[PDB]
Design an enzyme around this catalytic site. Structure first.
Site, short mmCIF file in Angstrom:
data_model
loop_
_atom_site.label_atom_id
_atom_site.label_comp_id
_atom_site.label_asym_id
_atom_site.label_seq_id
_atom_site.Cartn_x
_atom_site.Cartn_y
_atom_site.Cartn_z
N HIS A 1 -12.39 26.65 6.41
CA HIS A 1 -11.01 26.18 6.52
C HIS A 1 -10.17 27.00 7.48
CE1 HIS A 1 -9.47 29.12 3.50
NE2 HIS A 1 -8.32 28.89 4.12
N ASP B 1 -17.03 26.24 1.65
CA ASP B 1 -16.06 26.78 2.61
C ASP B 1 -16.64 27.96 3.38
OD1 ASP B 1 -13.76 27.19 3.99
OD2 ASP B 1 -12.62 27.98 2.29
N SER C 1 -7.83 34.87 3.98
CA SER C 1 -8.93 33.94 3.91
C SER C 1 -9.98 34.21 4.96
CB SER C 1 -8.50 32.47 4.09
OG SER C 1 -7.75 32.14 2.94
#
Ligand SMILES: CO/C=C/C[C@@H](NC(=O)[C@@H]1CCCN1C(=O)[C@H](NC(=O)OCc1ccccc1)C(c1ccccc1)c1ccccc1)P(O)(O)(Oc1ccccc1)Oc1ccccc1
Lengths: 10, 28, 251
Positions: free
Chosen positions: C43, C99, C198
């Site tokens: 992502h 992910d 992230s």
């Protein structure tokens, strides 16, 4: 906010 | 890589970081 | 990272900063797994709901860093991307299942006191360490609070949480490709990943061979360090067949 990086990398 | 999880400034020279012991103590 | 502390020098030599060329800004974290391969969250690179779609030429990988904003001359190494590989079954439509993404560098990066790869787990690595209550370590240059930014790389240690507890904390559908970590409210202690973290690594130090293994990738959270919420991580071992396939085929 970010310090300039050597032109070679851009 | 054969080496790679062995940090040059820690495992490679037998030095421990300030909180790795917290991890070890959780591994029962 | 919320409620963490400044990293020590060389504490996370596999840490990678994904850096946007323009505007110049922190994009996400990532990790070094060899001299030519970097691991991150899918992502961070592709998220259609928000018209996020980076190509190789849009970013740089900065390795060996400590300070967030400074150009760390003679210490950091800046690398260009040859190719991005996103998991083909990455589910951006629903819950960020799978992910994970790899990026191949144009040239091999030289290892140093500040730049060194992390190990990836094998099956027994995962079986032995991925247990409720066992702690891992998350690092990044993300925000210090949900609602500012750190001078240097932040670190926090957080316990793996029982699967039913993870599932009961959220309305998102959780899959076997995810695990959650963080303290419960009754445990008093705090800490979480936050915006900017992230793609970075969740690592554990095996007590058997004294090597660091990357068990997770920072994937998603509902806010940062909220009581009763937990951070979710991609389960690296469960997607390792894919990782190997990509590296074996593309070098
Ligand atoms: C503004 O909200 C944050 C967006 C981006 C963050 N997530 C995201 O980009 C992803 C995809 C879109 C929603 N995102 C989220 O992570 C969502 N969290 C989210 O929206 O939380 C709000 C928030 C506010 C302030 C800081 C951080 C987060 C998440 C969610 C889960 C439960 C309920 C609602 C949403 C969700 C998960 C899977 C699928 C959909 C939603 P990111 O720091 O990489 O993740 C972190 C990292 C650490 C902690 C929290 C979020 O960075 C971009």
């Amino acid at each position: 906010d970010f310090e300039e990086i050597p032109e070679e990398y851009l | 890589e054969a080496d790679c999880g062995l940090r040059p400034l820690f495992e490679k020279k037998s030095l421990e970081d300030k909180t790795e012991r917290e991890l070890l103590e959780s591994y029962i | 990272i919320v409620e963490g502390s400044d990293a020590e020098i060389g504490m996370s030599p596999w840490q990678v900063m994904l850096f946007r060329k323009s505007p110049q800004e922190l994009l996400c974290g990532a990790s070094l797994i060899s001299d030519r391969w970097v691991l991150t969250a899918a992502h961070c690179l592709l998220y259609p709901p928000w018209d996020k779609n980076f190509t190789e030429n849009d970013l740089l990988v900065r390795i060996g860093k400590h300070s967030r904003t400074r150009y760390e001359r003679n210490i950091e190494k800046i690398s260009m991307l040859e190719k991005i590989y996103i998991h083909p079954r990455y589910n951006w439509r629903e819950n960020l299942d799978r992910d994970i993404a790899l990026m191949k560098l144009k040239k091999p990066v030289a290892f140093s006191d500040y730049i060194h790869p992390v190990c990836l787990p094998d099956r027994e690595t995962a079986a032995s360490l991925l247990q409720a209550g066992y702690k891992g370590r998350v690092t990044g240059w993300g925000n210090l609070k949900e609602t500012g930014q750190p001078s240097v790389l932040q670190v926090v240690n957080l316990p793996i949480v029982e699967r039913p507890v993870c599932k009961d904390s959220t309305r998102i559908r959780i899959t076997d490709n995810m695990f959650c970590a963080g303290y419960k409210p009754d445990e008093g202690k705090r800490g979480d990943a936050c915006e900017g973290d992230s793609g970075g690594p969740f690592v554990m130090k095996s007590p058997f061979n004294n090597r660091w293994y990357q068990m997770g990738i920072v994937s998603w959270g509902e806010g940062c360090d909220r009581d009763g919420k937990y951070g979710f991580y991609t389960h690296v071992f469960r997607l390792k067949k894919w990782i190997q396939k990509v590296i074996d085929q593309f070098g």
